[PDB]
Amino acid sequence: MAGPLSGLRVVELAGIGPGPHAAMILGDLGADVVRIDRPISRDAMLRNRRIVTADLKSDQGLELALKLIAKADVLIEGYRPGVTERLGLGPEECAKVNDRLIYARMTGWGQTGPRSQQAGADINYISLNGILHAIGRGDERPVPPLNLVGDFGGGSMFLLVGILAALWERQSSGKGQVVDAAMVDGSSVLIQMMWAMRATGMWTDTRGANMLDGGAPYYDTYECADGRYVAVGAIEPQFYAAMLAGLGLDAAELPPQNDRARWPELRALLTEAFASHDRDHWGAVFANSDACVTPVLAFGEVHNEPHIIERNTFYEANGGWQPMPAPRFSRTASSQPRPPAATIDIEAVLTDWD
Amino acid sequence: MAGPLSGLRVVELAGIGPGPHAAMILGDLGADVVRIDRPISRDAMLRNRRIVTADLKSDQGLELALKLIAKADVLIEGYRPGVTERLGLGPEECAKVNDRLIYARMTGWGQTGPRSQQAGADINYISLNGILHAIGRGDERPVPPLNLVGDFGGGSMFLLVGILAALWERQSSGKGQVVDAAMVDGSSVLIQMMWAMRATGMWTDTRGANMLDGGAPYYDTYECADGRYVAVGAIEPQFYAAMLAGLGLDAAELPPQNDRARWPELRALLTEAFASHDRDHWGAVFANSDACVTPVLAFGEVHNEPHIIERNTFYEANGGWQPMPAPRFSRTASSQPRPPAATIDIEAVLTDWD
């Protein structure tokens, strides 16, 4: 298996959303990932893995898990705190048989604390630490940014950083440890810019009235003539001016970029402008500009866009497209992810592993 | 310095947004990070750093950068492809003097390809790979999820994973290499769940009409009596039912949870329920159940919420709260971050570095 984590050995305890997304990216990058289910998947998330089944409630699955864990560099689990403990696969149990194990725990609320036993999804984890409040248009109730922010950006990504850091540390302590990845915490450091910004008046708790939430007329989407959108990211004044040029608007007849008092008149001017031609027109107007003007593409249009084609951001599998691994390494490059293959006997893996 | 990356040595080439966010987290986690500016910061994002000054244009600063890079494990650069090359800090130059260097490049569009020389921000990178399309209410044009998805979740976080993986690979090749972290790619892998789901009919390019984008009445926000919001994440039927009981609704007078045909009647019923009382009323009602119902808190209200208090998700600094490091390590724990620090003579750092 190619890529930089070639050699690393990961055990994943099948659960939902963040945990597998982390196991996946490890896989993507060359790790040898082994996922334990209950007794083919056409879920792609389960690519770059071997799947085994066991019954960790029974004496005999318990025993085979530990055999796997003992040979493994990493364990991922994403259940309620106390659950691996009571199966007897806790951190203190795994330590007895392998004290070099990086024991990664993936939760919303964390290992400890009042909420640490309650159910929740992404929307609740980001409800509590400010993030969801800030997302959306001001005249309307907050909008969920999918599960991009807590599950992944603020969950699996921080689990991955926790695992790969703890692996750096082991390479001179020679021990592992437990990583407590809680989404409420990880998403907070994800949005730390806003927290910094709030302290110098460069961000406000008021919704829809900031520089990056769509309060700013030069940082938002515009509906075009044909009902589709373009995205404007022109913060820098030189970028903004190349944008005004493509639209063919005169700086003199416009409010200045940052006269917030007149941001409504500026937006109406930009709106009228962009609605006067279809999306694709603006693509051609602004091809090779610093205008920071791009088409808003629907998922099903993505594989036709040049820049996506030329860099193989995607590959074709099953129904349609998945993302190729990221990021990319110059010397030990990742290769095309392997599809989820049918089950494997758990014994044969111990034997693969010796 | 405390935390798991204690030992690691990072040179950051000052720029905007993703690259600093990466250097920050490294810092958070114990690395010794050293940032090179042009000629005290009030910005917290610059915590866990030492700041130094050089004119990389002149033979004087070029030469001092290389001395630092030569002693360093990681270099972070966030400029246009071709820019470090022309300064004479390209990858092949650094290799001359340090072939163990992890050379991490942080861009929107990537190192290569048609758009790789154009300006952009977060909103442009997520316009192109379907992400931005999918965010928002369907009767309104896509809404930006701040810069949470391209700059951080799909930017800095994948630079971090690239750096820490390349470090693992070095620990047996004994060479480093270049990581090409592009937001367009990183965010795609971030939203891999949707890509997978599209291919089994569990996701639609139609906007605001899915399970995690606010189309589901049981995964969305609701306005309360007092104008404020709660978040409902009640996907699992047992969660959903604990939610109906908290609101005091008869399960049997409601349309089935997944009779999408009557999702408008379900939502009206829930809307009516939740508007009948203030937010904080619900916050109490649901403070323990597995109803996956939580208050939507403004950033300014976060530090008062129990779960946040007990876990020290935040600390105070500069007349306001910032996020404590994440994730958390049981044996080599991170410390409270050090604030930015005034500038330092670059020679004194060379010296400190043996």
Residue numbers in the entry:
A (entry chain B), B (entry chain A): 1 to 39, 45 to 359
Paste lines from the article.
α-Methylacyl-CoA racemase in M. tuberculosis (MCR) has an essential role in fatty acid metabolism and cholesterol utilization, contributing to the bacterium’s survival and persistence. It catalyses the racemization of α-methyl-branched fatty acyl-CoAs, converting the (2S)-epimer to a near racemic mixture of the (2R)- and (2S)-epimers. The enzyme enables the conversion of α-methyl-branched fatty acids derived from cholesterol metabolism into forms that can be utilized by M. tuberculosis for growth and persistence within the host, a key component of M. tuberculosis pathogenesis. Within each active site, the large domain contributes the catalytic residues H126 (part of α-helix 3) and D156 (part of α-helix 5), while the small domain contributes a third catalytic residue, E241 (part of α-helix 9).
Crystals of the three MCR mutants H126A, D156A and E241A were obtained using identical conditions to those used with the wild-type enzyme and diffracted to 2.45, 1.64 and 1.85 Å resolutions, respectively. The three mutants collectively had fewer hydrogen bond interactions; within the H126A, D156A and E241A mutants, 3, 5 and 5 interactions were observed, respectively. The active site of the H126A mutant underwent the most profound structural change due to the loss of the imidazole ring, although D156 and its hydrogen bond interactions remained unaffected. The E241 side-chain which is hydrogen-bonded to H126 within the wild-type, is rotated by around 90° and projects away from the active site due to loss of its binding partner (H126). Interestingly, the normalized temperature factor (B-value, 45.79 Å2) of this E241 side-chain is lower than expected due to the peripheral Q243 (39.70 Å2) residue hydrogen bonding to it. As the E241 residue is stabilized by Q243, it moves away from D156, and hence, it cannot substitute the central structural role of the imidazole ring of H126. Consequently, five H126-mediated hydrogen bond interactions are lost. The observed displacement of E241 also suggests that it is unlikely to substitute the catalytic function of H126, which implies that the residual enzymatic activity observed in the H126A mutant is facilitated solely by the D156 side-chain. Wild-type MCR was the most efficient enzyme with a kcat/Km of 1.07 × 106 M−1.s−1, while the H126A mutant was the least efficient at 0.11 × 106 M−1.s−1. This near 10-fold decrease in catalytic efficiency for the H126A mutant relative to wild-type MCR contrasts with the near abolition of activity previously observed, but shows that although all three mutants had diminished activity, the H126A mutation was most detrimental.
